[PDB]
DNA sequence: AGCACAATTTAACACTTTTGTCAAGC
DNA sequence: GCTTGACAAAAGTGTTAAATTGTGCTATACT
């Protein structure tokens, strides 16, 4: 934070979780999750499933 | 000891019947340099029971 | 018999508070918002308690005289000058 | 009170929904005066918010008869209505800092953890102030420099 | 895993201070407050300052606040070492700590480096008082002003001392004498000291039912009475019919049967447009008419 | 349980207005967070109140 | 803990208005 | 059948004196 502090931002607590939910495109996060390909036989897709 | 010795026990405050009537506990105060009174010490009747707050209890 | 008074909160929300026709209408009212609200019509006569909450400056002034503080500030400034 | 409703639906109660429900924010952690034994103002049991203790009686008493109902006392701020409202009206608490609903955090599987790809052991460290989380990042400035 | 563990791992990171460091931070803080106040006062008094110097004072504030934060973060351990002793007295450990930190904050605001005393000497007072004062304001579900919490503890102290001297619980007279107050006061005080019990407790055997289930709602309506009350209103209606049209109205207004709010003789006489004495005379005759056996015998059962 | 929540919440406003360090403030938000957790599902995390 | 001090609430009270009441009378 | 003026009690209302209540503070050093 001392260096590079003006390039990013970080916080703790519920308000930080509140922010991650703020900038969260529900549809975008869904389409990338719509990937029924990308292997999937393993749990990695089930984890997304 | 060492951190108390020779603890005392005075005669009972009131009689069993008198305790059950007044709703008090059948107890005899105990004592222990500076002398200290530790508190009223419950006592066991001849029937092997205790009077705790006017009621006749039995320890199992 | 019902009087309808409207108050305005600092954040911009408004509330309707029915009162009795005969009784006085307050100027400020604790609203559902949880904030104080001023009535819109009737003039406010709001006699603010005007009690200034005690601050850290008050606690320092009552032990250091302004001269002692001035001398300290000179020490600090004479110190920052030397650092240059 | 018709006794015939078709559906019954739930949903996440938003902060606004909660604020709309409430009849006023409870500001103090007080219950009742240790002497008068009456509900303290601005606190829990506050008649000014939840409701009066006696039917059609405000706190101070300037309004006592059933004559006036639906009005509020300009002194104690108590609405003159049945004492039952004391069982139907809710309050609310405005938080100086947001807080996570434990049901969606610790509830297995973590509804929030699955919603953002944060392992429950990682998410637990975030909302409980055990680690920092990167909220934003400037890609153009990080690349140009 | 555990939160109180986390708070300790962070305060332990800060480096404790020696006597010399405390005074330096103390100086920087006082210089920060005066520098900030001087800049505000100069605008009020329409005064200016050298450009370079004015900008130097502004930095004195940034350095002053860093001193304030640094001074607190070093003595956080002291707050905890004092907060350990008040656990289990009806206040969570953390709450004691945070209240201690509140006291700690004030100590920093009032500490005096010129006296040459170690900081922990003067901070223990405020931190200690901050915790005790907190318990008197928050420990009890039904709050008691500190002065009453003060006397309650004083009475228990006398009680415990008198208990140790006499070998028997001191009576209200003995306890009132030693405390220089009326025996009735100690009784009134002993009523205030009692704390509430949990409705959610389980008095029934093996969780058969919680305690709250046995609480009557004495305000709930009584079906038989709401019916008798309704029959009484109907029966009075008939009794009102025997009286004069105006005479029946006077009885209604005088007791407020119609609008639910009684009216004084003047008010009643104002609606009928006669003296307030005339209404008094009319009412008395109504009662005599009402006490007649024919009209009155039916209503005795309603007690 | 409400008392623990409203107490810690109020103390937070106090600390925020006092410009207290982040260790104390963050320690308060964490305490506030746990008070609401106890109010809703006490014991679901950590030792119950 | 304890005490000082300020702020606030409660009491106390004097005083005025209001309300109920008696008598005598229109 | 109603009103008058007396008188009182009761109900208010403004002015003061307790009391109650809330806040600040305590300097060996104490982490
Ligand atoms: Zn009222």
CB proximity E147–strand G (7 Å threshold): yes
State the smallest CA–CA distance between residue D35 and chain C in angstroms: 25
Distance CA E149, CA E155 (A): 10
Determine the length of chain A. Answer: 49
Q: Write out the binding residues of D for Zn(2+).
A: 58, 60, 73, 76
How was this structure determined? It was done by: X-ray
Q: Do residues D70 and C18 touch, judged by C-beta distance below 8 A?
A: yes
User: 10 Å Cβ neighbour count for C84?
Assistant: 6
User: E94-124: buried (b, 16+ CB within 10 Å) or exposed (e) per residue?
Assistant: bbbbbbbbbbbbbbbbebebeeeeebbebbb
- Tokens 């009680």 belong to which residue? E159
User: 10 Å Cβ neighbour count for E64?
Assistant: 22
Centre of ligand 1 from the C-alpha of residue F6, in Å: 26
3-state helix, strand, coil in chain A (%, to 5): 50, 10, 40
Nucleotide nearest to E263 (CA to C1'): G19
Is E32 exposed, middle or buried, given 0-12, 13-18 or 19+ CB atoms closer than 10 A? buried
Is E23 exposed, middle or buried, given 0-12, 13-18 or 19+ CB atoms closer than 10 A? middle
Distance CA D104, CA A17 (A): 12
- Token duo for residue D56: 């059609």
Distance CA D27, CA B19 (A): 50
Distance CA B40, CA B28 (A): 5
CB contact under 8 A, A13 and D98: yes
Nucleotides of chain G in contact with protein CB (under 7 A) are 1-4, 7-8, 10, 18-23
CB contact under 8 A, A9 and D98: no
Nearest to D135 among A4, A9, A14 (CB): A9
Which letter does DSSP use for residue D135 in this model? E
The Å distance, CA of E278 to C1' of H1, is 9
Nucleotides of chain H in contact with protein CB (under 7 A) are 2-5, 20-31
User: 10 Å Cβ neighbour count for E13?
Assistant: 8
Chain A neighbors of D115, CB-CB under 8 A: 21
Shortest CA distance from F23: residue in chain A: A12
Q: Do residues A39 and A49 touch, judged by C-beta distance below 8 A?
A: no
Query: What Å resolution does this PDB entry report?
Result: 2.9
The Å distance, CA of E88 to C1' of H25, is 26
Distance CA D142, CA E173 (A): 81
């Amino acid at each position: 934070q001392d260096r590079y502090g003006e390039y990013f931002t970080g916080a703790m607590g519920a308000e930080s979780i509140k922010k991650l939910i703020e900038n969260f495109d529900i549809d975008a996060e869904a389409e990338s999750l719509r990937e029924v390909i990308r292997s999937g036989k393993g749990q990695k897709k089930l984890r997304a499933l | 000891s060492p951190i108390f010795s020779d603890p005392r026990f005075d005669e009972v405050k009131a009689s069993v019947d008198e305790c059950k009537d007044k709703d008090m506990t059948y107890a005899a105060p105990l004592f222990v340099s500076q002398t200290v009174f530790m508190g009223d010490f419950p006592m066991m009747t001849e029937k092997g029971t205790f009077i705790i707050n006017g009621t006749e209890r039995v320890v199992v | 018999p019902r009087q309808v008074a409207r108050y305005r909160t600092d954040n911009g929300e408004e509330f309707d508070v029915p009162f009795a026709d005969d009784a006085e209408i307050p100027g400020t009212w604790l609203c559902r918002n949880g904030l104080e609200g001023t009535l819109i019509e009737g003039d406010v006569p709001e006699p603010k308690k005007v009690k200034p909450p005690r601050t850290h400056w008050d606690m320092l002034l009552e032990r250091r005289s302004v001269e002692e503080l001035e001398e300290l500030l000179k020490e600090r400034l004479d110190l920052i000058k030397a650092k240059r | 009170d018709v006794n015939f409703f078709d559906e019954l639906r739930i949903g996440l109660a938003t902060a606004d929904d909660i604020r709309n429900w409430s009849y006023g924010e409870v500001k103090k952690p007080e219950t009742i005066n240790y002497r008068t034994l009456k509900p303290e103002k601005d606190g829990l049991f506050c008649e000014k918010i939840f409701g009066p203790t006696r039917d059609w009686e405000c706190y101070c008493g300037k309004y006592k008869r059933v004559r006036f109902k639906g009005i509020i006392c300009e002194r104690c701020g108590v609405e003159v209505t049945r004492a039952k409202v004391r069982r139907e009206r809710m309050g609310h608490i405005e938080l100086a800092a947001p807080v996570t609903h434990i049901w969606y955090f610790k509830g297995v599987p973590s509804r929030l953890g699955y919603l953002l790809d944060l392992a429950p052991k990682d998410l637990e460290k975030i909302i409980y102030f055990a680690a920092y989380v990167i909220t934003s990042v400037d890609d153009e400035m990080r690349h140009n420099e | 895993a555990d939160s109180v563990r986390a708070y300790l791992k962070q305060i332990g990171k800060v480096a404790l201070l020696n006597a010399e460091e405390e005074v330096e931070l103390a100086k920087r803080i006082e210089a920060g407050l005066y520098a900030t106040q001087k800049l505000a006062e100069l605008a009020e008094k329409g005064e200016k300052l050298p450009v370079q110097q004015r900008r130097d004072m502004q930095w004195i504030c940034r350095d002053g606040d860093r001193a304030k934060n640094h001074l607190l973060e070093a003595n956080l351990r002291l707050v905890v070492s004092l907060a350990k002793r008040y656990t289990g007295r009806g206040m969570a450990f953390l709450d004691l700590i945070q209240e201690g930190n509140l006291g700690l904050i004030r100590a920093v605001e009032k500490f005096d480096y010129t006296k040459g005393y170690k900081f922990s000497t003067y901070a223990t007072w405020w931190i200690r008082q901050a915790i005790t004062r907190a318990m008197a304001d928050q420990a009890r579900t039904i709050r008691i002003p500190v002065h009453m919490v003060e006397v309650i503890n004083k009475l228990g102290r006398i009680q415990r001392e008198l208990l140790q001297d006499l070998g028997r619980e001191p009576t209200p007279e003995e306890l009132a004498k030693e405390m220089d107050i009326t025996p009735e006061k100690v009784l009134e005080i002993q009523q205030y000291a009692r704390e509430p019990i949990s409705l959610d407790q389980t008095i029934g055997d093996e969780g058969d039912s919680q305690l709250g289930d046995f609480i009557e709602d004495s305000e709930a309506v009584v079906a038989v009475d709401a019916v008798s009350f309704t029959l009484l209103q109907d029966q009075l209606q008939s009794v009102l019919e025997t009286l004069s049209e105006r005479e029946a109205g006077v009885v209604r207004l005088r007791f407020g049967l119609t609008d639910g709010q009684p009216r004084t003789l003047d008010e009643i006489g104002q609606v009928y447009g006669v003296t307030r004495e005339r209404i008094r005379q009319i009412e008395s005759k109504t009662m005599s008419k009402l006490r007649h056996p024919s009209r009155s015998q039916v209503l005795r059962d309603y007690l | 349980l409400y008392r623990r929540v409203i107490n810690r919440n109020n103390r937070l406003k106090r600390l925020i207005d006092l410009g207290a360090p982040e260790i104390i403030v963050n320690n308060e938000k964490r305490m506030l967070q746990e008070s609401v957790d106890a109010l809703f599902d006490n014991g679901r995390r950590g030792r119950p109140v």
